[PDB]
Amino acid sequence: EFQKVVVIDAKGHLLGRLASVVAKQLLGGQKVVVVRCEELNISGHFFRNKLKYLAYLRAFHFRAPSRIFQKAVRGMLPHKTARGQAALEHLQAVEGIPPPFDKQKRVVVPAALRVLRLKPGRKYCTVGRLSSEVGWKYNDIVAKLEERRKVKSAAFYQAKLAKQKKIASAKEASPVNQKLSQFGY
Template identity: 55%
Template structure:
């Protein structure tokens, strides 16, 4: 169980719906999982682009009238927009602890560690634009329940978070795209090399198959080989 929670789950945000992905990620980080979300600029939002842009521009106008530097703070990077969406689904300010029957604990006030559940959950979440090292060489997952192609009708309009962020002030769209192209070229070369090595490995196994047949049978009997 401990290994399951120590393992970092890497999600590829491209092609996912913003709210659905954020809801699933929020629940999982609350449960204790560590999650990294890459390619946040490829996240989709249902509804046409112009409508979503107007909504975000209206959001940008919300500020403290006398001293805007005190907040609320409006992020422009797609990764931070997604992070803020997840934060809105977490009890990052509330102080709550749960209790049940024999395991029930009651306190006057709310002592640690029960006072920082939402904050601790946010610390287990990392978000990125593009796919930086070392995550570019690791397996990435998707969340089927949040994929646009699964959840949104083909005729429905949608907006891409990267374009929306760019039009409200994000300055690194071109840089991120350039770095992504370089990453894809490196990944292509790495995969070609991997296929060659895999082919040679299979050939080597085939060459010695007859010599190690008796050992293979013994290992299969004890369940070492399947």
Template identity: 45%
Template sequence: MQEFIYFLHTQGNPCACTVQLWEQKPRAIRQPSSQVLVLDGRGHLLGRLAAIVAKQVLLGRKMFVVICEGINISGNFYHNQLKYLAFLCKRINTNPSRGPYHFRAPSCIFWRTERGMLPHKTRRRQAPLEGLKIMRLKPTHKFALFGCLAHEVGWKYQAVTATLEEKRKAKARLHYAKKKLIMKLKKQAEKR
């Protein structure tokens, strides 16, 4: 049974989410809790968000990161594109199927960044990484968006996630209107 779910979204201030994430707990206690934290990736910087998520996962919390397409990477888009295209060329000469694996989806790129911040090479140390789930919901600046970068290096589903996000927003608007009507009727019933 999950106790709390937090939806965190702060435009342009990636460190503001640490205020609600940290709880006062003794450092020595690392028991897995049933608490699930849901983070909205929009507007956060890649490394800072990954560091915060890594710390929470190591403390035993379960994390969900959604809308990875909106995560910002510092530096302009062209520079980040060149860096990632250079990374795509790296492989093992004798058997390229052994790695390194080059992910194209923004959620997988974020997962790989997260894995680099966690000890993961033994079975015991893979447990924190299993507590992390990353979801895709939606796909001129000093920041490069994950969705645009992933699309340029081979991710094929940017248009699909955009249409799915529009459908989700339409459903959410209907649900919210229905909820407001129900709340209004409840208040009227309580007055009588």
């Protein structure tokens, strides 16, 4: 099932797997937005990606986690062609969750999840912490904003669940739900 706009929570996803999934979607005409890019995970110890980046530091050197992921997708696209540049403009990778996107459903990619792809006990790095060490200086405020949004969203879920309780109780109250329940619904 495909639609025009998807929001992907990047927490617990591997950088390469998620970018490759994202890149294939973009070339298919699907507008993709990736949020919480600083919770992205990378296989290997912290120093390994750290020496990878400082080698890259030794071209514009960008430190933000959202633009770290954007570079990963960019190498997986035909950027030299008008088709690739069109696809890239369809991708909006952001850190944290902007308010326009926190009120919408967020899907996850099972083929890219770290839990389903990394053996337990394997060391893994986080893009947010790696970026914060190479020059990024906004993880304090991003983390603080995350708590406020998480608190507000948690209250919304409680309100949604409380409203759900009434209809859930009224479901079995009506005898129609049990009159012809043989249909499987």
